[PDB]
Design a protein around this ligand. Sequence first.
Ligand code: SF4
Ligand code: SF4
Ligand code: SF4
Ligand code: SF4
Ligand code: FES
Ligand code: ZN
Lengths: 208, 123, 114, 688, 38, 117, 84, 71
Amino acid sequence: TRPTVRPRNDVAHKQLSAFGEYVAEILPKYVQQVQVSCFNELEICIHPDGVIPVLTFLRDHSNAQFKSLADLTAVDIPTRQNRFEIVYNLLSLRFNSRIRVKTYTDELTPIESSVPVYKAANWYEREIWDMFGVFFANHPDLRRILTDYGFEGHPFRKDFPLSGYVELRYDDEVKRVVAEPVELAQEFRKFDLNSPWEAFPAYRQPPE
Amino acid sequence: ITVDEKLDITTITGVPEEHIKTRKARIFVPARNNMQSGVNNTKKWKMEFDTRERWENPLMGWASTADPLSNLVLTFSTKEDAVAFAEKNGWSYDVEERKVPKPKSKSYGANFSWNKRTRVSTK
Amino acid sequence: TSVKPIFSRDMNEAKRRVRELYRAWYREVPNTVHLFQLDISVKQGRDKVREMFKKNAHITDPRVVDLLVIKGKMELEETIKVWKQRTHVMRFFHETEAPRPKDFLSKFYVGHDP
Amino acid sequence: SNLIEVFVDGQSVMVEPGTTVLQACEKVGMQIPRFCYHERLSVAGNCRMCLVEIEKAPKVVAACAMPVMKGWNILTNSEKTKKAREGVMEFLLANHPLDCPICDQGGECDLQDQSMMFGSDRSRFLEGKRAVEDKNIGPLVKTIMTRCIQCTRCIRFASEIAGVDDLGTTGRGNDMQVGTYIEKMFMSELSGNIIDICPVGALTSKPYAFTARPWETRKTESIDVMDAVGSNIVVSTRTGEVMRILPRMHEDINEEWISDKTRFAYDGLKRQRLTEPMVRNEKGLLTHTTWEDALSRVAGMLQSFQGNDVAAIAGGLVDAEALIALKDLLNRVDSDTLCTEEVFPTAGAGTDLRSNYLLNTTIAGVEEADVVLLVGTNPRFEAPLFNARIRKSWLHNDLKVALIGSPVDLTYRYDHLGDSPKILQDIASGSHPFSQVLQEAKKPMVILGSSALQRNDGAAILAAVSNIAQKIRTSSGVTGDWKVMNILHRIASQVAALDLGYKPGVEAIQKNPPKMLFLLGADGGCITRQDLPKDCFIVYQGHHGDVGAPIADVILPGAAYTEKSATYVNTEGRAQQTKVAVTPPGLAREDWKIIRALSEIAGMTLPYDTLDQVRNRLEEVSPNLVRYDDVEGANYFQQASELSKLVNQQLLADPLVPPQLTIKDFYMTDSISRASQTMAKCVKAVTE
Amino acid sequence: KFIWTNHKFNLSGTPQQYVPYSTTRKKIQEWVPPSTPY
Amino acid sequence: RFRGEHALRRYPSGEERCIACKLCEAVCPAQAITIEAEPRADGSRRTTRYDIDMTKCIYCGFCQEACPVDAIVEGPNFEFSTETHEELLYNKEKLLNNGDKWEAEIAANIQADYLYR
Amino acid sequence: LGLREIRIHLCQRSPGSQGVRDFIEKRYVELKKANPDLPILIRECSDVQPKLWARYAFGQEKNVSLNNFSADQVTRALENVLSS
Amino acid sequence: YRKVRFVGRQKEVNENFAIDLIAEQPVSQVGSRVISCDGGGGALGHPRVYINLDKETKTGTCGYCGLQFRQ
Ligand code: SF4
Ligand code: SF4
Ligand code: SF4
Ligand code: SF4
Ligand code: FES
Ligand SMILES: [Zn+2]
C-alpha cells in the first residue's frame, strides 16, 4: 500500500497452501480442520484421539520431517463447551517451515501423552498439569513444578483470582512461618479500557 | 474403547475454600455508558460477583480490602452457555435479561404539517 | 457419557483404590513425627487423616473420585521423603488463626455479613 | 408483504417501505458514525457525518434522513465513503480548543472515539481557532460553549420533551452561539438531564465537576427510590464512595431519561448521618453506646408489655424485606395496630386484590390511549417521567386531556374543566362539557392522583370516580377490556408495604394511646409526642436524624438505599431489587438483621436467617414479589366497585389543591432531599 | 525564587524523619445528637 | 537523561505546574500513583492528595513522558537509603520540597534534551 | 386470636385452578358482605396447588390446598376456618 | 488520635503555598480580542489555547496557566 506497511509474498502463501493440502487427504480419520494463517503459517485441527499418530506420521517421513518440538502450550477458554486448547508446534529442520497442532480437550477427559514420540515434552507436560489440571495419561513422572506445595487452584486459569488466598507471614508465636487469609493494603484498581464503535469491520461477527 | 456411558451431574469441589455457599454470582448484559453512543460494549453476557467491605488503611487512605475475588469479569457468548458454568463449579446465580429497543417509526419530512401537531421550528 | 476413564470403571475398583492408600497414610503418620523433629502427640496426626477422608463422601460419579486419588497418590512422594522443610506439613493444623464465630449473634457484633 | 428487499454491502435484508439507510444498516449490525441524530429526538441533517456511497450513483447522500427505495446496493465501506468521513471530520476539529487535560468528558467524548477509529491522522490548519465566551444557566449545568460542535442536539431537546422553549440558534455563518440571548435562567424538572445529551464537553455537571475520570469507576446497576415509578440507574463508585449516577435506559420506564431530583441527590447520602447506637441519658441528653448495651434494653420492655400498647409506623423508603421482620415480630406477640405514614382511605376494599390501587394501564399503555382525564393531582412534580410520557403521547398522534382543580402549569394545552369536588358528582351525570366524550372514547383513561385522596373526603371521591369508571365500562366498555380506573403515588415504599397486608392511614394509633412505638416512618410529623401520651419511650430506627431522632429514646442505625440488597415496587407491581454499592459506614447495619438480633435476644426466634430464607417468607405471603418486572392481567374489580358502594360519604367544599409550589416544593421533600446541600444551594437561586 | 537556603539532608531519624500522613478531609461527617436540654 | 528521585516542578512565580489531568497514574505499569483531585476554591482544578510509593516504583519513565503540562519529572539524584518502610511512601508536600530543593539541576537537564522528544 | 385473616391464592391460567375463578364470581360480594372485620387477602400466582393460608394463634399457619374443587366445594370449605 | 506518629519527628510540611500566589502577578493587558498563552516559554508549559477577553474585562487564567490574564 505504502511504506511502513508489511510487504507480503505469494510464494510461501502458495507453497504452504499446497503442502498441507495433503495432510488432510492422507489421514482423514483425525484431521478435521486445516486453515492457512495469513502470515504464512499453518494450523491443523486434530481430534484428541489422534494425539499420538499425527505426530508419529510427522515425526519421521521423507516429505515432512518436523523433528523439533519448539513449544507446547495450553490455553483455557470458558464458553466453548469443551474448555481448554492444547497447541503443539513443530519445526521442519530440513525445510524451514512451521505447523501447529491444535487439539481441543476437556478437564476430565485425559490426553494420551506425547512422551514416547518426543522426549522434549517431558517437562512441558508436568508443567501444564500444575497450571490447569489436564491429566496427561501414562506419564512416566508426574509431579509438582513451578508451584508451592500448598496451592490447590491451578492458577493460570480464569477462575483463580489474581492474588491468591494464602498470603504468607512470620510470627514468633512459636518459630514457624505461617499462612493467613489474604490481606491487601491496596485495592488493585480495575480500570476499564474497552471503548466502543467496533473499529474492525473485516473480523465482524455474524449479525444474529 | 471402554466408553462407560452413564449420567451423573458434574460438580467439582476442593479448589476454593469456603466461598462456594457464601457468594451468589450475577449474570448480566452491560448497557451503554450513556455519556457516549457506541454500542460495542453490549453483545457479551458477563458475570460479576458481590461487593463487600472496603475500609480505610489508617496510614494513607488506600481503600484496602480482603474479599479476594472482587475483580473477575468473564465474557460468555450466550445465555445457553452462561448458566452452564455456574453449575459446573457449583455456585448460585441470578439471571438478568437482554433488552433491545423499539424498532421504531421515525421519518424526517413529518416535521412539517398542515393540520398535525408535529411541526418544529428554531432550526 | 462418552469419555474414557482414568483408572477405574464403575464404583468398585475406585472404592477399593481409596481404601488402599488409607493404609499408606495410617502407616506414615508416626514416621514424620520424628523424621521432621516435630513435637506433638502421635494421635493428633491420625485424627487429621480420618477427618480428611470423610469430607468428600457426597460423590455420585466415577473419575471424579479417581481425580482425588491422583492428588492423594502424589502427596506420599513428598511426605514419605524429605521435601517439605517442616513447614509445609504443619499448615494443615491452623494453630495461629483465630477462631471464627459460626453462630449468628456473634457475627452480628463484628463484621458486615461474612 | 409490504417490504423492500434491499441489499446492504452485497447481502440481502428486508425492511419496511419507509425506513432509513441508518436503521437498515443498523439491522445487519453496523454503526455509521452519528452526530446529529439521537433516537428519542427529531431528525436534522446539519453535521453531514453519515455519508454512505450508494452504488451506481455519482453523488453521496446522508443516511440519517432519506427513505430507502427499491433495492439499492448500500455500499458502506468503499473508496468514496472513506474519503468523506475523513474529510468531514477534519473540519470541525479545527475550530476547537486543545483541551483534554481538564475538560470533563475526557473518557467518552465523540470527537475522540471517532477520531482514532474513523477520521484523519494529522492536522493542517495551522493557526486560527475562534474563541467564543461562556455564561451561566443554572447551578446545575456548568456551561463552556467554547467547545460546541454546534450539532443542535440540545436545542431540539427543549422544543421536544422538556417543553420549555428557551434555547435557540443565534447568528449567521461561523458567528453563532447556542445559549439563551437574554440572561434568563433555564430550570425545570428534567433540566439537568441535558448533560447526557450533549455529545462533547460543553454541558457538564456542576457538583461532580472536577473529581474523577470515567475509566476508574465501578458500574453496578441499581434502582432509585425517591419517587413513584422508581428508576433505573447505575451508580459509579471510585474508592467506596458514590461519585455520580446516570440513567440506564429501560424501555418502558426511563425510556432514556432520568429525573433531575433523582440525579443530584447523592450528597444527602453522606452528609448528615447517624452511625452508632445511642443511650438515653435521662435529660435531653442522648449519648452513644457500645453495641451490647442497648439490645436487651429495649428487648426488656417487650416481655413486659402485651396487647395493643406497642405499635410501629413505617412509611418512608425502607424495603420489602425489613417490613416482614417487623410484621412477624409484632404479630407473633399478637399486637398488630401498625400502619404506614401515608393516608389512604378504605371503604369496601383496599388491602384485598386492591382493584385500582396499582396503575392498571401501565406506562406502555399510555401511548395507546385516546382520551385521558385526570383529577385531583399536579402530575408534574410527582412522577415526572410519567408526565414526559404524556408529553410524548400528546405529540406523535392526537390526544385530548382535561384536568379538574387548581390551574397549574402543564406544558401541553389542557383545559381546566372545573375546581370543586362537585364536578365529580355532576360528571357521573351528563353535563359541563366533554360530558360524553368519555362515553365516546375508544380507549379511556381516568387517573386519580394520590394528592387528593389523602384528604378527609377520600372515601367519597374514591367511590365517585369508580362510578364513572363503572359507567364507561358497562356501556361497551372500550372494545374490549382496556382497564380504566387507576392511581399513582408519591411515596416509593407504599405499594411494597401495603400489599404485604398492612392497613392504610394512621387512624388506629390516632384513637388509642399505646406506650412504645417504633418509628420507621418517620420524618413526616403525623405523630408527635404531644399527640402521644406522656414520656413513655419510643425507639427509633433509621439512618437520618432530621425530625424524630432528636425526640426519641434509643436510636438504631440503618443502611439507606445504596448499601443493601433489597426490593421495591413501583406503581405497576414490578419488583426491582436494588444491589450493594457501599458497605454502610461505622457501626451501622442492615435493617432486617437488627430485628432478628432483637428477636433472638428476646423470647421468640424467627425461622429464617439468610436473605434467601427471607424471600421464601415473602413468597409464602405474596407470590408476585419474586416475579420480577412483569405485569399480570388481573383486574377482578366489577365485584369491588359494587361492594365499594357500601359507604355513602359525601363530598366537601374545598378546591382540590396540590401542595406543590411554582417549583420550590419539588426540591425539599423526603429525607435525602433535606440533608443534601445542593438542593439547599439550588433553592435560594430560584427565589432570587 | 522558591529555592532553598543552602541544602538539606535525607536524615534517618535526626529526630526528624518526615513521617508521612494523609492529606484529605474526612468523608461522612457523622451527625451529632441534640443538646442537653430537651 | 538519567532516572532517579521524583519531583514536581512549578512555573515562574509559583503555580504548582500540575493540573490533575490523570494520565501519570493511568500508565504507571505498577500502579504507584494515587491522585484524588477536588475543585479548588479559585476555580482552577488541582490535586489534594498525591502519593508515589518509592517501592512499587519500577522506574519506567512513563510518568515523565505522559504528562501534557510537563510537570512530573524523574530528577537526577540517586540520594536515598532511609531506614523505615513507613517513610518511602511519598505525599504531595514531600515532592514539592524535594522538587524545589533544586530546579537549577533539573531545568538545566530538560532544556538540553527536549529537542529529541 | 383466632382468627385474623386468610390468604386466597390462585393462578391466572393453567385452568385446574378454575374453582376460585367462579368463587369470586359467586361468593366474594356475598362472602365479604358477611364479616366486615376480617381482611382476607387475595394474591397473584402460585401457578400450581392454589393453596389457602390461614394465620392466627400468635402467628401460626394453617394451609389447605384446594387443587381443583367445584364452585360449591370452595363455597363450603371456607367456613371450615371461618366458623372456627 | 492520629497525631502521635510525629512525636519527636518535627512533622515536615510545605512552607510556601501556591493556593493563592496568583494574585501578585501584574495581570497583563492587551486591548485586543483573543490572545494566545503558551505560558512559560515555547515548547514547554501548557499547550496553546485562545481565550476570549471580553466581559468588562478578564480572561480566566486559560484553565491551565494559573496566571491572572486580562485586558
Ligand atoms: S451544547 Fe454544544 S454539543 Fe450540545 S447541542 Fe449545543 S452546541 Fe452541540
Ligand atoms: S470535548 Fe472533545 S475536543 Fe473537547 S476536550 Fe473533550 S474530547 Fe477533546
Ligand atoms: S503531572 Fe500531568 S499527569 Fe501528573 S497529575 Fe499533573 S497534569 Fe496530571
Ligand atoms: S517511574 Fe514508572 S512506575 Fe514509577 S511512578 Fe513513574 S510511571 Fe509509575
Ligand atoms: S450524520 Fe448526523 S446528520 Fe447525517
Ligand atoms: Zn497560559
